[PDB]
């Protein structure tokens, strides 16, 4: 599958990135996994162990093998104090097929939902599985969520309504589950609601971070849809937005402003949206050389946004610099709101996650087995 030509170009650009890292990073840790992960999410927990020079952090990872046994993994990592690093397996759980995406429940972080190459979305409570997985590889989810006909990626837990989960699928639908309901015994729960507003593969879904009834969806039909779970319709959203000129792959709500939303597309742009008036696209971020697949706001800075995708790059944006005049020289590198380009990966970035406890720290995973934990130099954002 490899392009020996492109590989030489990538490798030589990497060597240049590597020696530039002391300029650009306060922290760079790189780890090669046996298998690539399509998913990353930091767990909310952190601790500074007595008599140690590092902090303990946790990552939810997955595995991607077509041939062999897959696993849902929680990784323990050492993050060195500002006065290299280490990764270990906290727990490893047998998983049928690759883990498309894995998300922890905000109210109960040891509950993790996963998307699979099949239609069932699985739920795991990692406190209810053996410390070491049985080599037989039999996958025993605590819950199987029924409702989809095809696989997907989009996953979202309601952070205001415990146990409520959204999922997006290639079958054109968004499914809704309430995992606290169901029968006594007990493993299978059916979709409470199935939303069919889209006419193509729905790529991502996301609850509003403040209103428990609002969520957004995003599809290959180039539309952004805003839904209300109160309403007795599941075929028509509250708002239908012509968001992009190509497939929309991701969306992310700002954790500081209940009205603003970000959207990422195959048209190589990120769009800013305001929920109070969706006829007007607030802004367009341009710089990416290929399809954008993931977008996430910083959990510490309201004006900071990050995006990534097929161009092996991760871009960090600063909203507070939009419209700011640049010299003709600086304009060649991109618009004034482009803060930082991360060139540490040598293949497509599958997913990334902002560290919720250490400002500016990000974990990104690529298709060539690499996971990087990094933090850009203070000199770059401290202006």
């Amino acid at each position: 599958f490899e392009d020996t030509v492109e590989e030489r170009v990538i490798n030589e650009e990497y060597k240049i990135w590597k020696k530039n890292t002391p300029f650009l990073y306060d922290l760079v840790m790189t780890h090669a996994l046996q298998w690539p992960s399509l998913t990353v999410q930091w767990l909310p927990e952190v601790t500074k162990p007595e008599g140690k020079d590092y902090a303990l952090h946790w990552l939810v990872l997955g595995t991607h093998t077509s041939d062999e046994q897959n696993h849902l993994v929680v990784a323990r990592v050492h993050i060195p104090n500002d006065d290299t690093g280490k990764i270990e397996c906290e727990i490893k759980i047998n998983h049928e097929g690759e883990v498309n995406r894995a998300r922890y429940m905000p109210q109960n972080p040891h509950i993790i939902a996963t998307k699979t190459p099949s239609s069932d979305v699985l739920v795991f409570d990692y406190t209810k599985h053996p410390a070491k997985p049985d080599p037989s590889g039999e996958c025993n989810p605590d819950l199987r969520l029924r409702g989809h006909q095809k696989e997907g990626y989009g996953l979202s837990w309601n952070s205001n309504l415990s146990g409520h989960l959204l999922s997006a699928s290639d079958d054109h639908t968004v499914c809704l589950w309430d995992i606290n309901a169901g029968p006594k015994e007990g493993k299978i729960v059916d979709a409470k609601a199935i939303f069919t507003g889209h006419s193509a593969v729905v790529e991502d879904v996301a609850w509003h971070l403040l209103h428990e009834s609002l969520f957004g969806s995003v599809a290959d039909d180039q539309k952004l849809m805003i839904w209300d779970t109160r309403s007795n319709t599941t075929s028509k959203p509250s708002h239908l937005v012509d968001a992009h000129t190509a497939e929309v792959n991701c969306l992310s709500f700002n954790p500081y402003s209940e009205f603003i939303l970000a959207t990422g597309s195959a048209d190589k742009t990120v769009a800013l949206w305001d929920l109070r008036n969706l006829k007007l696209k607030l802004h367009t971020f341009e710089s990416h050389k290929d399809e954008i697949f993931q977008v996430h706001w910083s959990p510490h800075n309201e004006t900071i946004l990050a995006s990534s995708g097929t161009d092996r790059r991760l871009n960090v944006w600063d909203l507070s610099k939009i419209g700011e005049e640049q010299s003709a020289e600086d304009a060649e590198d991109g618009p004034p709101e482009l803060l930082f380009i991360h060139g540490g990966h040598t293949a497509k970035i599958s997913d990334f996650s902002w560290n919720p406890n250490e400002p500016w720290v990000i974990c990104s995973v690529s298709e060539d087995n690499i996971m990087q934990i990094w933090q850009m130099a203070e000199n770059i954002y401290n202006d």
Binding site: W17, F23, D330, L339, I341, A377, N379
Partner: peptide
Amino acid sequence: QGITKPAIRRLARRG
């Protein structure tokens, strides 16, 4: 060389 802050900031945008 590219040690000043404006230069580092410009390196950052170039990746």
